[PDB]
Amino acid sequence: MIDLRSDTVTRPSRAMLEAMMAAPVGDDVYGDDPTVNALQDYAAELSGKEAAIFLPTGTQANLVALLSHCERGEEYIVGQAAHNYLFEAGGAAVLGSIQPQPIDAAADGTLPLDKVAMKIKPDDIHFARTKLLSLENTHNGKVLPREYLKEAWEFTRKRNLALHVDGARIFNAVVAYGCELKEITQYCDSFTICLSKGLGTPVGSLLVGNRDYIKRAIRWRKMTGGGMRQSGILAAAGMYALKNNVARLQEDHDNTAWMAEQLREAGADVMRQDTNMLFVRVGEENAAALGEYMKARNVLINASPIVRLVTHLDVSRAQLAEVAAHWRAFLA
Amino acid sequence: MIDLRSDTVTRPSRAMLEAMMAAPVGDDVYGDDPTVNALQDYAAELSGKEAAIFLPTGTQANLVALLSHCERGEEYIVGQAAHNYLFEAGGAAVLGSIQPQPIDAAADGTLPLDKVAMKIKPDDIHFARTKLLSLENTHNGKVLPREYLKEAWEFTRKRNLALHVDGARIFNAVVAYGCELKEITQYCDSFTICLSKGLGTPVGSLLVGNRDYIKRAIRWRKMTGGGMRQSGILAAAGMYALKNNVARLQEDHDNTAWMAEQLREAGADVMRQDTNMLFVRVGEENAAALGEYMKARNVLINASPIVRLVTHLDVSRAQLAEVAAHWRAFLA
Amino acid sequence: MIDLRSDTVTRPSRAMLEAMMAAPVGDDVYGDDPTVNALQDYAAELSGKEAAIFLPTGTQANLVALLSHCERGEEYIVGQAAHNYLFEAGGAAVLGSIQPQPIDAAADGTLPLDKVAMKIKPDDIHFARTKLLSLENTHNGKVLPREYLKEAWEFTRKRNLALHVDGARIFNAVVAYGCELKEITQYCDSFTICLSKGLGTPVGSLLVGNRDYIKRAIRWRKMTGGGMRQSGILAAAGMYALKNNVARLQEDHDNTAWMAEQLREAGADVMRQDTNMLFVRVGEENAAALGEYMKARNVLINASPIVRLVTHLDVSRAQLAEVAAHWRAFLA
Amino acid sequence: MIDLRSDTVTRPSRAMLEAMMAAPVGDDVYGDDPTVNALQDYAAELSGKEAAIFLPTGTQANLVALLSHCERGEEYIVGQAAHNYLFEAGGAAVLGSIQPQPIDAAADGTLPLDKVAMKIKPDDIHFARTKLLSLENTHNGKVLPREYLKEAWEFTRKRNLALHVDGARIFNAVVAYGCELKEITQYCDSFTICLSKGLGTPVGSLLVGNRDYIKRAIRWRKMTGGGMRQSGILAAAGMYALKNNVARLQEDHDNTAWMAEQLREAGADVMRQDTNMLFVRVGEENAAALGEYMKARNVLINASPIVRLVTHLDVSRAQLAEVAAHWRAFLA
Ligand SMILES: *Cc1c(COP(=O)(O)O)cnc(C)c1O
Ligand SMILES: *Cc1c(COP(=O)(O)O)cnc(C)c1O
Ligand SMILES: *Cc1c(COP(=O)(O)O)cnc(C)c1O
Ligand SMILES: *Cc1c(COP(=O)(O)O)cnc(C)c1O
Ligand SMILES: [Mg+2]
Ligand SMILES: [Mg+2]
Ligand SMILES: [Mg+2]
Ligand SMILES: [Mg+2]
Ligand SMILES: [Mg+2]
Ligand SMILES: [Mg+2]
């Protein structure tokens, strides 16, 4: 079927499945899984960091990432629309006892440093203790300006703040940048990697940072429930994906801007196109209707005034042609 | 000694102390303290609410209120500069496992209902569960419009959201409206009352609401550590304060409005003036230099590029006239 | 390789892997994964419960269960040596703001109802609010008496307390009782099921209960980070495991009971033997020395003055006979 | 009236009241209260510690004491029947995110060190991180053996554990010991002092420890709501009590063992007598009945199978004679 709801719907490729069934495993609680360790070391090395850790979800990757950075009473400055603030049921505050300090991101997706500075609280018993600055490289598809990344890292060091990046779709950014992962990963103390979305993995996310940081991450992961056993089978896929599915992300990107043009031709009001994501202003009076129309044509989208269409390896251009045709028919 | 730093410096008048030293007391934990109970029933009756609870501080009155309103994982929309979000060291999140959703307040001190609406979370496992809208009347002196208070009240009912008002200086707004307290508390499910501010009490606050709500608040006040014993001694100052110090707040207002013209007609840059508060932009170069010049003449003002002068019952106009002069002498 | 450390080392059989590699999957967050849903409905139906939820680990199945049962400030009575109190880094309190009330378990593994009763808190603001009684069937191998399970069930209803059972090895007790799973799950409101232990799955657990309870558990599983995507691949091993690996647990039991006689009739001090678990008091002087002697011959046993040997599908009797010999050779 | 429910019902003496109305005050949030500072320095000096802090309640003193000692995920070993575990609505876990590890106290009221050692968790991700050992000198009236205090302190230093003592009635212990406060205070890193119970204060408790510890206590107190303003009026009483009400505690003690004898003569089954507390095994079938009988004779006690009678300065021996007579009449 044609699914444009999220790149999270990506299913295992033939090659990936065999890599998995082939991978050697062990008990990762003891650290005896060759594959988990191999994936963790690859990411670490690939990003220029000391150590990495495998978690069940990107949600748990960020929760653990936040608990690891901030103690009870500390606070993190994040985007009002960032994932580890808005889309993680408020875990950091509810579970971690961390005060969140959200601020609106700028149009390009960055967090205005002048605003971040204004939110750093003085060492007064009145306020929470600002500790972390969280970013999200690839925010609703937008790739942060490389210069800004350098600026934030520099900014944080000057203010003694830790810097963490939600790299759910960090490889989309990499491919869009045209550089290596380590070249953007140098500007953050820690960052996450989701294997389950664009890279085509069934389950999996990674938190990468220095040795000590990750050791604290290990205690938190166990507590939050991520301490799995024979994760080797899952990690195997993650290794295969990092060595065979990063480059093709460019194919998704061209499909996004290709589709963006088709919908423009058809008459749909396209709001913007960034990486594997495009947004259309469908409208309130056409939301649910378009949903059904499509859903009928075996096309799955998230019905809404502003529909977010996401691309991935399980959607071809030909299939996009179909949806662009079905859409054109909708509007006229 | 001339303290324009805050209205929190007000000291007990001899009549207040006597009222305290001659009050009958009992074990409040056992609910055997006459004066405490008397103070509560009086606040409840005067505001149209069923019950009331006395607490050590407003900070605790709000932490308790927030805990009594939101279960673990629940959320409260508030102002980025509001007290129960910014000035209570993130208590609601750190201790109460409550997710805070702060937004910028409009110029007049209100939380734009349109902005508030966009922040109400869809009922999806993705988000925290929006449950409370917490206001602040008298917000840095600013008196919230009355039509907004009625509109927020209606908005929250149609959204099934509770409405709480941090009334640390509610009586200041009350005198400014020229109405009864009941006429504004009718637009909220719960509100607080600090007696230790302009009303001149040594310490103590009140949280008022529905009988069942307050019953829960009693469990939280205990856990947080506010369940005192013979606190009727303190509650006594409260009654005395509520029966004699409400009307004279108009005197503080006139003085602030007075000082404003004097400082203005003296070379000072008066940004704005609301109730017992005045704001003068002094700037870097003269900030710290101003604090010292004053500190010497016994005039205490929180130095800063933008100084906040707070009038209260312990600062006379004559004394203000003096400071004024001392400020017109600062420029030369 | 001979791992008697835990039954958590069980590795996937080729038939299990195939079942996993050929399973249809979908986005579980969207509830679109056939196998995951299939696995849940099967566990629910087989236990007499309305709903079921798949999780990354048992540790998370219990944290979620506890959170779904107790609101902030609520409490759960448990065993001092129980898993959701002792071996999950205090998660219920640290992350869930739940007060734990642990008590020593009787010799047979049960929590003495008389002791439990004394621990139920009076409804007074002095105490936490007792709400759950959490058991553990198979408790270090010990099979809880059936009359106690029925008695705890009745006790909790007459006290209006929920009853949860940590069933990490529930099927081990089940085979030992010689009854159906439904006949014991009928005595609890919720229970867990680990598939990654004796049942031989690579990872995964289940929490089962009433439809409304489980709906809440879904919100908590997300927040804690267990809301995976195409997890049907994992859920597949679970179904395969539940349809083929339950009965053969009797083989582990016989082997443990077998090894016990061998080690006993060899000079070893066998304290006790329950289901797939055996305990031998080795003592200080021979503890670490034993671990090394074994470690060399590839036999892995958690060294300690009191060694805990765990049998499972990946350790044959023939292999046990070998270890045995290697142990009778340790004394000389 | 005659109140034997608790020494918390103690009311202000003429001398105390005048000391209060006389005391000079200020804003303690800024630290400008002469009296609060004077009380804090007196306690500190009197106990041989660096600094002290004034809180509204003993409950908040312990909560703050626990938050100050243990970070999120750390754990404290305390008595199953200790106040900061059982009688503080579980604040440490609910609010502080601290895992509690309670164990039964021995008959003399101490925590068997052999048990404490058994509960210290290894540095493994399975367990919470043992950090603090909490004691309660004067536990239900029992005075801990001095030798044991020395032992626990020594024990904790050897194990790198912090030691805290709930000194709600620490002065009862002092008077019973016959030594100075500093001689028992040397065996703890921190300890609390309740001014509101036996010492005859209306409100008030103190936490005493080293400079850094108390500084952390200050941030926590503010967050939990204890940061009061003109606390001078309350502190004044606390100073008067520490200089005029410690010695007479002996009068309460003799009244307790005097009354214990009278009740024995009358026929009541006295369980034990320690300091200002005695326990009678009234029985279930006579609980409520005795309550009314007494309550009628204007005598207030906590009705129960085992009645706890507490002495204090507001109950004279003559009044005890009355109650012992009313009791005798009850039984015969
Ligand atoms: C989806 C997502 C996450 C979390 O991953 P889940 O698999 O949904 O838990 C974190 N950050 C971003 C930016 C995401 O898009
Ligand atoms: C001062 C104040 C509080 C709380 O008072 P504390 O005594 O500092 O705890 C709450 N809200 C507002 C708006 C205040 O100005
Ligand atoms: C192993 C186990 C758990 C949880 O399993 P993890 O995979 O370690 O999270 C829960 N309860 C018992 C009794 C166990 O033995
Ligand atoms: C009463 C008491 C406390 C707490 O004091 P409150 O005034 O009740 O908050 C702490 N410890 C002991 C041993 C007590 O008896
Ligand atoms: Mg996928
Ligand atoms: Mg919390
Ligand atoms: Mg005051
Ligand atoms: Mg396994
Ligand atoms: Mg008292
Ligand atoms: Mg907590």
CATH code of the domain containing B88: 3.40.640.10
Across-strand partners of A78?
A102
Structure tokens at B158: 């149609």
Query: In the 3-class helix/strand/coil scheme, how is A242-282 assigned residue by residue?
Result: HHHCCCCHHHHHHHHHHHHHHHHHHCCCEEEEECCEEEEEC
As for how many domains chain A has, the answer is: 2
Across-strand partners of B75?
B99, B130
How many other C-beta atoms can be found within 10 angstroms of the C-beta atom of residue B243?
10
Angle formed by the axes of helices A14-22 and C14-21, to 10°?
Answer: 160
Q: Which chains touch D (3 or more CB pairs under 8 A)?
A: A, B, C
Q: How far from A231 is each of A40, A226, C102, C196, C215, CA to CA, in Å? A: 12, 10, 32, 11, 27
Across-strand partners of C306?
C281
Length of chain C: 332
Boundaries of domain holding A135: 1-244
A259 & A234 share domain: no
B67 & B21 share domain: yes
CB contact under 8 A, D89 and B60: no
A206 & A295 share domain: no
The answer to whether the CB of A191 falls within 8 A of the CB of A166 is: yes
Chain B residues with CB-CB distance to A90 below 8 A: 73, 75, 99, 127-128
Coil, helix or strand at residue D287? helix
Out of A63, A137, A166, A194, mutate this one to test ligand 1's pocket (max ligand atoms within 8 Å of CB): namely A194
**For residue A275, is it left (φ>0), alpha (ψ between -120 and 50) or beta?**
left
Length of chain D: 332
Pocket flag, ligand 2, residue B207 (CB < 6 Å): no
D132 & D16 share domain: yes
Structure tokens at B286: 């003269």
Element holding A115 (H helix, E strand) = helix A113-119
Instruction: Sheet containing A306-310: give its strands across.
Output: A270-274, A277-281, A306-310
DSSP A120: P
CA-based R_g, chain D, Å = 20
- What's at C268, amino acid-wise? A
Q: How many CB pairs under 8 A join C and D?
A: 62
**For residue A52, is it left (φ>0), alpha (ψ between -120 and 50) or beta?**
beta
Q: How many CB pairs under 8 A join A and D?
A: 27
Q: Give the one of C97, C125, C219 whose C-beta lies nearest to B222's C-beta.
A: C125
CA distance B220 to C325: 62
Q: Which atom of ligand 1 is nearest to the CA of A136?
A: 13
Give which of A47, A69, A60 is closest to A213, Cα–Cα.
Answer: A69
| CA A45 and chain centroid, separation | 20
Ligand 1 centre from A59 Cα, in Å?
Answer: 6
Residue by residue, DSSP assigns A175-201 as: HHHTS-THHHHTT-SEEEEESSSTT--
| CA A223 and chain centroid, separation | 23
CA distance A310 to A2: 11
Longest dimension (CA), chain C: 63
Element holding C191 (H helix, E strand) = strand C190-194
Helices (H), chain B: 14-21, 34-47, 58-69, 83-86, 91-94, 113-119, 146-158, 170-177, 182-185, 211-224, 232-244, 249-264, 284-296, 317-328
A228 & A273 share domain: no
- Positive or negative torsion for Cα B27, B32, B35, B39: positive
Domain boundary among A224, A244, A264: A244
Residue nearest to atom 5 of ligand 2 (CA): B58
- Nearest ligand for residue B70 CA: 6
Q: How far from B140 is each of A72, B143, B152, CA to CA, in Å? A: 29, 9, 19
Question: Resolution, in Å, please?
Answer: 2.1
The answer to whether the CB of B162 falls within 8 A of the CB of B189 is: yes
D93 & D31 share domain: yes
Coil, helix or strand at residue D240? helix
The answer to whether the CB of B138 falls within 8 A of the CB of B105 is: no
Q: Count CA within 13 A, CB hemisphere, residue D325.
A: 7
Chain B residues with CB-CB distance to A87 below 8 A: 126-127
CB contact under 8 A, B93 and A94: yes
Query: In the 3-class helix/strand/coil scheme, how is D296-307 assigned residue by residue?
Result: HCCEECCCCCEE
Q: Give the one of D26, D89, D202 whose C-beta lies nearest to B233's C-beta.
A: D202
**For residue A34, is it left (φ>0), alpha (ψ between -120 and 50) or beta?**
alpha
The answer to whether the CB of D133 falls within 8 A of the CB of D152 is: yes
- What's at D39, amino acid-wise? L
Measure the CA angle with vertex A9, ends A8 and A11; round to 5°.
115
Task: Output D174-178 pairs: Cβ under 8 A, ≥24 positions apart.
Answer: D174/D246, D175/D246, D175/D247, D175/D249, D175/D250, D175/D253, D176/D143, D176/D253, D176/D275, D177/D143, D177/D146
A3 & A118 share domain: yes
Domain boundary among A202, A224, A244: A244
CA distance B4 to B323: 10
Across-strand partners of A209?
A51
CA distance D137 to A168: 54
Domain boundary among A244, A261, A288: A244
A158 & A277 share domain: no
Buried b (16+ CB within 10 A) or exposed e, C76-113: bbbbeebbbbbbbbbbbbbbbbbbbbbbebeeebbbeb
Task: Output D217-222 pairs: Cβ under 8 A, ≥24 positions apart.
Answer: D217/D53, D217/D64, D217/D65, D217/D68, D218/A125, D218/D53, D219/A73, D219/A125, D219/B89, D220/D63, D220/D64, D220/D67, D220/D68, D221/D53, D221/D55, D221/D60, D221/D64, D222/A125, D222/A126, D222/B59, D222/B88, D222/B89, D222/D29
Residues in C whose CB is inside 8 Å of some CB of D read 72-73, 75, 86-90, 93-95, 97-100, 102, 125-128
- Positive or negative torsion for Cα B267, B272, B274, B280: negative
Q: Give the one of B87, B100, B125 whose C-beta lies nearest to A93's C-beta.
A: B100
A240 & A288 share domain: no
C240 & C282 share domain: no
The answer to whether the CB of B89 falls within 8 A of the CB of A126 is: yes
The answer to whether the CB of B163 falls within 8 A of the CB of B153 is: yes
Pocket flag, ligand 2, residue B59 (CB < 6 Å): yes
DSSP D139: B
Q: Which atom of ligand 4 is nearest to the CA of D139?
A: 13
- CB-count burial class (<10 Å; 0-12, 13-18, 19+) for A332: exposed
Coil, helix or strand at residue A129? strand
| Residue that is written with structure tokens 């691309």 in the block | A311
Out of A6, A8, A166, A197, mutate this one to test ligand 1's pocket (max ligand atoms within 8 Å of CB): namely A166
CA distance B133 to B74: 12
CB contact under 8 A, C222 and A90: no
Q: How far is B85 from chain D (nearest CA, A)?
A: 11
Residue by residue, DSSP assigns D74-113 as: EEEEEETT-HHHHSSTTHHHHTT--EEEEEPPPTTS---H
Instruction: Sheet containing B306-310: give its strands across.
Output: B270-274, B277-281, B306-310
CA distance C90 to C69: 16
Structure tokens at A160: 């003694």
Ligand 7 centre from B38 Cα, in Å?
Answer: 21
Residue A222 phi, psi dihedral angles, 5° rounding: -60, -50
CA distance D86 to C128: 8
How many other C-beta atoms can be found within 10 angstroms of the C-beta atom of residue B285?
9
Q: How far is A81 from chain D (nearest CA, A)?
A: 27
Q: How far from B99 is each of A95, B69, B90, B124, CA to CA, in Å? A: 10, 12, 10, 15
- Positive or negative torsion for Cα C148, C150, C152, C155: negative
Ligand 9 centre from B241 Cα, in Å?
Answer: 24
Ligand 1 centre from A58 Cα, in Å?
Answer: 5
Residues 6+ away with beta carbon under 8 Å from C29: A8, C222, C227, C228, C229
Coil, helix or strand at residue A213? helix
- What's at C8, amino acid-wise? T
CA distance B275 to D50: 43
- Positive or negative torsion for Cα C209, C215, C216, C222: positive
Ligand 8 centre from C237 Cα, in Å?
Answer: 11
Residues 6+ away with beta carbon under 8 Å from C154: none
- CB-count burial class (<10 Å; 0-12, 13-18, 19+) for A66: buried
CA distance C58 to A216: 21
| CA B101 and chain centroid, separation | 20
Measure the CA angle with vertex B136, ends B189 and B17; round to 5°.
90
The answer to whether the CB of C20 falls within 8 A of the CB of C237 is: yes
Pairing assessment for the beta strands D277-281 and D270-274 based on DSSP bridges: antiparallel
In B, minimum Cα distance to D31 occurs at B9
Pairing assessment for the beta strands D162-165 and C162-166 based on DSSP bridges: unpaired
Q: Count CA within 13 A, CB hemisphere, residue D45.
A: 8
Structure tokens at B82: 């509001």
Give which of C120, C168, C164, C123 is closest to C142, Cα–Cα.
Answer: C168
The answer to whether the CB of B75 falls within 8 A of the CB of A100 is: no
Give which of C83, C117, C77 is closest to C101, Cα–Cα.
Answer: C77
- What's at B272, amino acid-wise? R
Give which of C88, C64, C16, C56 is closest to C216, Cα–Cα.
Answer: C64
D328 & D249 share domain: yes
Residues in D whose CB is inside 8 Å of some CB of C read 72-73, 75, 86-90, 93-95, 97-102, 125-128
The answer to whether the CB of D269 falls within 8 A of the CB of D279 is: no
Residues 6+ away with beta carbon under 8 Å from D198: D7, D10, D169, D171, D172, D245, D249, D252, D276, D312, D313
C237 & C261 share domain: no
The domain that holds A254 is classified in CATH as 3.90.1150.10
Pairing assessment for the beta strands C51-55 and B306-310 based on DSSP bridges: unpaired
Residue A66 phi, psi dihedral angles, 5° rounding: -75, -40
